[PDB]
Amino acid sequence: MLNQFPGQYSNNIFCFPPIESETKSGKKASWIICVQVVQHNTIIPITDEMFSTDVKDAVAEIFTKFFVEEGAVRISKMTRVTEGKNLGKKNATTVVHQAFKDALSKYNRHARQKRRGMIPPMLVKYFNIIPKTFFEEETDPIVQRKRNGVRAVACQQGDGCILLYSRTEKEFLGLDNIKKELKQLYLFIDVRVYLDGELYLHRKPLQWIAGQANAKSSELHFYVFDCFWSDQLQMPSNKRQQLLTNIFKQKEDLTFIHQVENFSVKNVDEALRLKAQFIKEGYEGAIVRNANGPYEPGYNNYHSAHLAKLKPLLDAEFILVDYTQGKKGKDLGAILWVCELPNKKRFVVTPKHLTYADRYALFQKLTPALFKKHLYGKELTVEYAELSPTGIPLQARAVGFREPINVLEII
Amino acid sequence: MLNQFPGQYSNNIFCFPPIESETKSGKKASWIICVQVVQHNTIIPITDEMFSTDVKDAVAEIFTKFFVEEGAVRISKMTRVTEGKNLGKKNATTVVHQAFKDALSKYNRHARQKRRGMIPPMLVKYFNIIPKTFFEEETDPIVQRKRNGVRAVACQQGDGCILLYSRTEKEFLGLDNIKKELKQLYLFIDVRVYLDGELYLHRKPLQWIAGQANAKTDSSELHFYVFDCFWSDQLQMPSNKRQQLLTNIFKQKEDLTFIHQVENFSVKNVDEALRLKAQFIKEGYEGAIVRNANGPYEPGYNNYHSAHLAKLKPLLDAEFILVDYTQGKKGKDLGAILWVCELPNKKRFVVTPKHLTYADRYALFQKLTPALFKKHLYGKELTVEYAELSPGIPLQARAVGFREPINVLEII
DNA sequence: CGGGATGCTGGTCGGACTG
DNA sequence: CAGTCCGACCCGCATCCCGGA
Ligand SMILES: Nc1ncnc2c1ncn2[C@@H]1O[C@H](COP(=O)(O)OP(=O)(O)OP(=O)(O)O)[C@@H](O)[C@H]1O
Ligand SMILES: Nc1ncnc2c1ncn2[C@@H]1O[C@H](COP(=O)(O)OP(=O)(O)OP(=O)(O)O)[C@@H](O)[C@H]1O
Ligand SMILES: [Cl-]
């Protein structure tokens, strides 16, 4: 299929992307290679069918065009492809398909003769909250599913090696099914691009997925949800996702590598419905990306404020050790609980099922005495997001106690 | 030049190493490829001169031999090499040289069709001490120079990539001069081998060497000095055997410019080892490495240090505040005074008086008082020769002397 | 300095080859 | 007769050498 090759198609002539460079004189140079199909002294339009079956007396011609900054163009002689290769085998190529292969050959080699390490993948700062600025952009944010697998970044070392490394900046062993497909895909795409994704196979626990990724069965898939260039880390998230989609338009025959579906939302409610939907399809949640977010690598565990994860909260039990009130605004005068981690380190937990009138009334009517006799030392189940690395649970809310009490009635 | 190719030479026929395999029946199979040079219907001996100039009407013949466990041998047809390649260019090969290239081709491909990640480099436990067990082995230990550079392990990923990683298990950028030569060297050597060495360029500070190794834009001026090798499937292999394999690897290619084997020295006693250490310091190296002859390769998994290597280097210098004194507990150190300095973190450690006899250490610990020490030694600054920092206390610490010099034997 | 030619390794294809 | 080896064919990466500026 055409458009699997990089470049623009126009007036029946397909041209690969111009490769620009500087010369000794300091002027700008451009070099372009182009493919055309000639039958009966006529350039005919290129069709997807002629990649499977030849057309009678059609000849493919390849030529290059070269010119300095605002100078006259120079053309090469036409190399005529009149015949496919591996002509007897199942490897056989059509004339047209073989010409594009030779064109992409000369193109990739020209790029190599006239032209990179591991970058830590970007990390998500926000958790079940979407900053209002996400919907103040000219473009709507993107929503993606949140797969509970193992994270991996792909790149090509320039010598030709495909690098698959981890969130801990560690190269992966095995995954030959994926590295094989990445080697194929990198012939058709810019070799400097980093592909950022998740190793995963659906309906499988993370212990199994992490088991295959770390160990040295070729059954995992690679779901790419982002890309970036080392020299253009400020490129907006939106533009990075159009480029990523042009990369995957090229190859749709891949079996183990997949682009992650992108969803547009205009408000928080649209986003929370997609998060609901992905949980029922068995995923871990949703990812929200600001449309103008740059690529902020996670150097020294840095989290970007232009992504948000939408996940369900974790469950745990803690010992209630004290109570207090909120400080800021509406939370001022509203009661908060103080649980404690086994390290005697303590944290605030928010009553989830009480109105603000209750939180005000409860903090007014409670005494150190009545809390020592009825609440101290009780076990309290706490929905929380993450543990601050401090170990403190973040965004902690009290679901309820084991032994059920009504705190409104305590005397 | 012949011995640049793996295999044995005998009766004028060179044969590459047998590649063994299993069959469905479970019997052992062996496959061998061999090269011979025939002139006038006679196998003539292969010479290094035939790699630069052809011999008239000599033809090189390549053939394979294949046989199952204790079964009759099967022979292939002879592939005749009558002509070198790149015949007009400076790339030209002789007939004989071209045949060995084609043999090593079929050999490497057969090995690939019938057949690995980072392992943390092994770490040195002992410091300016050589255990007596090093000299109880059937073979004498090996001493090497200690280059103050950056450590690196080389291996080949099997797909064809050359991996150069660090002690931190992190792949290196740049070093194209070194990776280029490793790719050429790995055509002739077992592809399963790890080469363990040091990135270095002599008479240059470590800030510069580390500067070129870490950055992705080095000037391609560093060298790679290999001092060990290992196989993932045979980490119990004794140090001695690993160094012959390593030396056979480097016998092959001596044309390399950026890759070097580290000179091996035999010693029979501690004094022999310390003279080599002295000698390397005067040539500007950091010290010596001592390897027990039967030491396996123990990778530094959780910063694990192997008790079958020892470094011999000069000690570091520092100043600490004297805060207390005590005595030794074990044997000859019993009743002998020790000082107690303190790190800025208020953590304290024992320092040994270096220039006092044991009679002095006994007398001092008997005659000293908390009073006399609080008034003349407490809080003073004391220079301390030490080895390393315990992962923070200085280890093997010795007192050179104080800033303001006092004679502690005369304190009253 | 751009590119054809040459040779190399790794990939796939297809036809023996042999227990 | 089931892998099991291997020549053949392509292709990306090197180097060598000769136009092409
Ligand atoms: N489409 C996606 N976009 C971004 N991240 C995704 C996506 N699908 C799955 N993920 C995973 O979610 C993680 C979000 O980054 P974050 O810093 O939140 O990780 P974490 O909190 O340490 O791990 P977890 O999110 O599992 O608790 C990434 O590491 C990635 O592996
Ligand atoms: N011939 C050699 N054999 C072994 N190690 C060598 C040799 N030459 C230099 N070295 C270096 O000495 C180091 C000894 O390992 P060790 O665990 O003692 O390192 P370290 O103590 O953390 O670093 P340093 O030795 O610089 O203090 C190796 O990492 C290696 O880089
Ligand atoms: Cl040396």
Author numbering:
A (entry chain B): 1 to 115, 121 to 221, 224 to 396, 398 to 419
B (entry chain A): 1 to 115, 121 to 396, 399 to 419
Question: What text does the study give?
Answer:
AsfvLIG catalyzes the DNA ligation reaction during the base excision repair (BER) process of ASFV genome. AsfvLIG is composed of 419 amino acids and is one of the smallest DNA ligases identified to date. However, unlike the homologous proteins (such as HsLIG1 and SusLIG1), the fidelity of AsfvLIG is very low. By solving four AsfvLIG:DNA complex structures, including the non-catalytic open form and the catalytic closed forms, we showed that the NTD, AD, and OB domains of AsfvLIG undergo a large conformational change during the catalytic assembly.
Crystals of the non-catalytic form structure were grown in the presence of ATP but without Mg2+, which is an essential cofactor of the adenylation reaction. We found that the non-catalytic structure adopts an extended fold and the ATP is bound by the AD domain and stabilized by various interactions. Besides hydrophobic stacking with the side chains of Ile294 and Phe232, the nucleobase of ATP forms one hydrogen bond (H-bond) with Gln149, via the N6 and OE1 atoms. The sugar pucker 2′-OH group and the oxygen atoms of the phosphate groups form H-bonds with the side chains of Lys151, Glu203, and Lys316. In the non-catalytic form structure, the substrate DNA was bound by the NTD domains of two AsfvLIG molecules and adopts regular B-form conformation; though the DNA adopts a regular B-form conformation at the two ends, it was significantly bent and unwound around the nick site in the catalytic form complex. The ATP was captured in the active site of the non-catalytic form AsfvLIG:DNA structure. The catalytic Lys residue (Lys151) and ATP-interacting residues of AsfvLIG are highly conserved in the homologous proteins. A bound ATP molecule is present in the non-catalytic structure, demonstrating that AsfvLIG has ATP binding and catalytic mechanism commonly shared by many other ligases.
